[PDB]
Design an enzyme around this catalytic site. Structure first.
Site, PDB file in Angstrom:
ATOM      1  N   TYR A  72       0.833  -1.199   0.000  1.00 38.76           N
ATOM      2  CA  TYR A  72       0.000   0.000   0.000  1.00 38.76           C
ATOM      3  C   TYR A  72       0.872   1.255   0.000  1.00 38.76           C
ATOM      4  CZ  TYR A  72      -3.167   3.508   1.980  1.00 38.76           C
ATOM      5  OH  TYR A  72      -3.875   4.667   2.281  1.00 38.76           O
ATOM      6  N   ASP A 123     -11.116   8.695   5.632  1.00 41.29           N
ATOM      7  CA  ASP A 123      -9.907   9.497   5.642  1.00 41.29           C
ATOM      8  C   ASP A 123     -10.356  10.956   5.562  1.00 41.29           C
ATOM      9  OD1 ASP A 123      -7.318  10.538   5.138  1.00 41.29           O
ATOM     10  OD2 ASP A 123      -6.809   8.826   3.868  1.00 41.29           O
ATOM     11  N   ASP A 126      -2.625   4.875  10.400  1.00 45.38           N
ATOM     12  CA  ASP A 126      -3.730   4.231   9.694  1.00 45.38           C
ATOM     13  C   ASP A 126      -4.082   2.941  10.391  1.00 45.38           C
ATOM     14  OD1 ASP A 126      -3.723   6.297   7.748  1.00 45.38           O
ATOM     15  OD2 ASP A 126      -3.498   4.871   6.085  1.00 45.38           O
TER      16      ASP A 126
END
EC number: 5.3.3.1
Lengths: 125, 125
Positions: free
Chosen positions: B14, B38, B99
């Protein structure tokens, strides 16, 4: 009011209370119906008495905990990276988790989740 | 099977895809019904097409992203600290989020949440 400043202050008070073995100082940070899932995946301890005992057990051995990066605070949530170090039978161990808090309106912690796996436990022989 | 090794591999793929501007490589990491929030607090983009557009927009400007600490992987979940840097009108900006991924049985990402606030955006004048 949950401002990033308040949530960041709470993470610092939590980390400091762990270092001091201040059980009342840790429990006082949580809502009476708060939950703790340490580590992620297991079953969550619920309520004030369960949470106090959990930490009472964690604090059997002296912990040296420190924040390793800035605290991320946004919308009733805070996440932070830190390390917990302790010695046992001559072996020094360092657990490197990422915790995640979710605050309520009153600015108290309603839920805590500690994320770390075996790759985040760094002990010698 | 979601092993910490697989989940850690996915976080690395990612991060690398973001650096390369490889939109197909990022979207391929998600479940078709996955959600992206996000930043935390906002409204989540849902499904493959919405997620692709989101990243298509993020990738308007060249991003330099790098993992700043070990990835925490445990029980279908992974959390990681990283920085995204970009320049704009002569100003260099660095966003420092944490994250959080949650994987499905097939080992694909079902949900992504990026946690960072104004205190995690570090730009000059």
């Amino acid at each position: 009011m949950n401002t990033p400043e308040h949530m960041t202050a709470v993470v610092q008070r939590y980390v400091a209370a762990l270092n001091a073995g201040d059980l009342d100082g840790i429990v006082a940070l949580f809502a009476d119906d708060a939950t703790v899932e340490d580590p992620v995946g297991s079953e969550p301890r619920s309520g004030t008495a369960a949470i106090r005992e959990f930490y009472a057990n964690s604090l059997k051995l002296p912990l040296a905990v420190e924040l390793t990066q800035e605290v991320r605070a946004v919308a009733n949530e805070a996440a932070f990276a830190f390390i917990v170090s302790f010695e046992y039978q001559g072996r020094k161990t360092v657990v490197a988790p990422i915790d995640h808090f979710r605050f309520n309106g009153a600015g108290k912690v309603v839920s805590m989740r500690a994320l770390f796996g075996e790759k985040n436990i760094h002990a010698g022989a």
